[PDB]
Amino acid sequence: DSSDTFPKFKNPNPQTLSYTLIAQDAEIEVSPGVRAKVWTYNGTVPAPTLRFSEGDDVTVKFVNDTPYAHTIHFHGTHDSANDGVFPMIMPGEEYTYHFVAEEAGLFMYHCHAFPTSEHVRMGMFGTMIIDPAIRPMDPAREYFFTLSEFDPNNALEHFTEFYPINGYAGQYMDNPIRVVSGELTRFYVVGIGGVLQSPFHVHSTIMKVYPSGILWNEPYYAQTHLIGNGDTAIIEATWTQPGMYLFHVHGIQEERGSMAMIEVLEDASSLSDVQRPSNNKGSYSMVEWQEDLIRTLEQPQLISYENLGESAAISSEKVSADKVSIVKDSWNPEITESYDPIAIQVDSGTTVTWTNDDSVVHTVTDNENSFDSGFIQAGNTWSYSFDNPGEFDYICTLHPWMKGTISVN
């Protein structure tokens, strides 16, 4: 078989679960003395760890409380309506994701609005642990770790100032990850950068690794395991000699917040009040301790907005033209007119042509919703013949500040 694989299995006792995740802007500490603006689910980076069992029925209420468009994209098997691309969730709006957990493993979830690197770099990612139904994982002390890239001064910097483990740079140096001599330990590790890959390395012991976080796989033994961005790994290890050790991504990341200290204790006694019974029956979850510490260190200051979705009326003078530019840098809200001419007039029967002069995809979408371009790729055009008189107000469904009008005579 394996004896170490967990084949896909029909859960005889599925449960029905629900979560509420809110897209929220905040100011958090990301390093000692470094406060930065972030885009979150529920106020921390990373977002909450979701944990349930293979076969469970899961519903996530998603609320957008920001002036950007956002989604939730979950890794793993589901259908198009629940894949987090279609539709974009607009400021002030809500969406319900729903799925039966089709397979066990370690997955992630993150925003899929455009440009996606910007939304992930600002903080919109989290961990999703799906426990196997055929049998529980071996009894272990369990921790989770996101590996990310963060720069407080330029979100999209190729090389970021920080490569935090769980959002706050260096947190596990002052607050070591505690393990118990001779006790199996399991790390749920999520790679979620955009540029460099992550060689995940732990000192002084050999890792057992499920590749891609998929429990159907035979695991393998590693001193270092390369986790690609958008991949995960379930890792088990045992330390047998009390003392201090390290784990870290192996590379320049380890000087920039991707390093953690491991404290090997002689027994589990000092942990009995901090650990929690795991959804893997017989295991000991430290995830609650971790998320408590993430919130303590980050000290989030939530930002609340009034009149989300409301915007002034276009009052620009109408131009007789059949060609419209989608303006360069429109993915920045600071560009106050995103189409040019923002208001056009044409005769009945006229084909109007939009050119995307930005470097990011945009759309042209009637909100009375009589026409819709879909994605218009950077540099490409989209055309439509207007055969019905009236005024049509249109938007970009990716960037809610983006609007225009066309008057057909």
Residues tagged in the binding site annotation? 70, 73, 75, 110-112, 119, 124, 201, 203, 248, 250, 362, 396, 399, 402
Strands 276-277 and 232-237: unpaired
Nearer Cβ to Cu ion, position 74 or 168? 74
Annotated binding site for Cu(2+): 70, 73, 75, 110-112, 119, 124, 201, 203, 248, 250, 362, 396, 399, 402
Q: Decide if residue 181 touches other proteins (CB under 8 A).
A: no
User: If binding is defined by CB under 5 A, does position 399 make contact with Cu ion?
Assistant: yes
User: In whole angstroms, how close is the CB of 331 to Cu ion at the nearest point?
Assistant: 6
- Residues comprising the binding site for Cu cation? 70, 75, 110-111, 119, 124, 250
Told to check if 86 binds other proteins by CB under 8 A, we report: yes
Closest residue by Cα to residue 202 from 144, 283, 287, 260: 260
Nearest to 104 by CA among 69, 132, 67, 70: 132
- 75 in contact with other proteins (CB under 8 A): yes
398 binds, among other proteins, Cu ion, a second copy, none (CB under 5 to 8 A by kind): Cu ion
Query: Within 10 Å of residue 317's Cβ, how many Cβ atoms?
Result: 8
Residues contacting residue 26 through CB under 8 Å, at least 6 positions apart: 37, 38, 40, 43, 300, 301, 302, 303
User: Beta strands of 238-277 (E only): which ranges?
Assistant: 243-249, 259-265, 276-277
31 makes contact, choosing from other proteins, a second copy, Cu ion, none, with CB < 5 to 8 Å by partner type, with a second copy
- Tokens coding 4: 């170490």
- What gap in Å lies between CA 407 and CA 405, rounded to an integer? 7
Out of 20, 87, 138, 159, the only residue in the binding site for other proteins (CB under 8 A) is 159
Q: Which two tokens stand for residue 361?
A: 């995809």
CA separation for the pair 103, 53 (Å, rounded): 9
How far from 250 is each of 116, 198, 238, 298, 395, CA to CA, in Å?
A: 26, 7, 20, 25, 45
Which of 70, 121, 225, 403 is the binder for Cu ion (CB under 5 A)?
A: 70
Nearest residue to 50 via CA among 28, 75, 27, 71: 75
Amino acid present at 8: K
Residues 6 or more apart in contact with residue 117 via CB below 8 angstroms: 156, 194
Among residues 398, 401, 405, 408, the one that binds Cu ion under rule CB under 5 A? 398
CB of 108 to a second copy, least distance (A): 8
298 binds, among a second copy, other proteins, Cu ion, none (CB under 5 to 8 A by kind): none
Q: Which of 53, 54, 70, 73 binds other proteins (CB under 8 A)?
A: 73
- Of 116-135, binders to other proteins (CB under 8 A) are 116-117
Q: How far apart are CA 49 and CA 29, in angstroms?
A: 20
Q: Is residue 113 near Cu ion by the rule CB under 5 A?
A: yes
Rounded Cα gap, residues 223 and 200, in angstroms: 9
Considering the rule CB under 8 A, would residue 85 count as an interface residue with other proteins? yes
Please state the closest distance from residue 297 (CB atom) to other proteins, in A.
22
For 120, the 3-state DSSP assignment is: helix
Q: Would you say 329 or 387 has its CB closer to other proteins?
A: 329
Q: Are 199 and 250 within 8 A, CB to CB?
A: yes
Tell me which residues in 235-274 interact with other proteins (CB under 8 A): 241-246, 250-252, 254-255, 264
Discontinuities in the chain with C to N beyond 2.5 Å fall right after none
- Buried-state track 188-201, b at ≥16 Cβ within 10 A, e below 16: bbbbbbbebbbbbb
46 binds other proteins, rule: CB under 8 A: no
Q: Nearest to residue 118, comparing CAs of 30, 186, 39? A: 39
For a second copy, the closer of residues 166 and 350 by Cβ is: 166
Strand partners for 243? 264
In the shown chain, the binding pattern of residues 13 to 52 toward Cu ion, with x for contact by CB under 5 A and - for none, equals: ----------------------------------------
173: partner contacted, choices Cu ion, other proteins, a second copy, none (Cβ within 5-8 A by kind):
a second copy
Footprint of other proteins on 361-390 (CB under 8 A): 361, 375, 377-381
Tokens for 394, please give them: 């249109």
Which residues bind to Cu ion, rule: CB under 5 A? Answer: 70, 75, 111, 113, 119, 124, 203, 230, 246, 362, 396, 398-399, 402
Which residues bind to other proteins, rule: CB under 8 A? Answer: 73, 75-81, 83, 85-86, 103, 105, 107, 115-117, 158-159, 193-197, 199, 201, 203-206, 211-214, 216-218, 220-226, 228-232, 241-246, 250-252, 254-255, 264, 356, 360-361, 375, 377-381
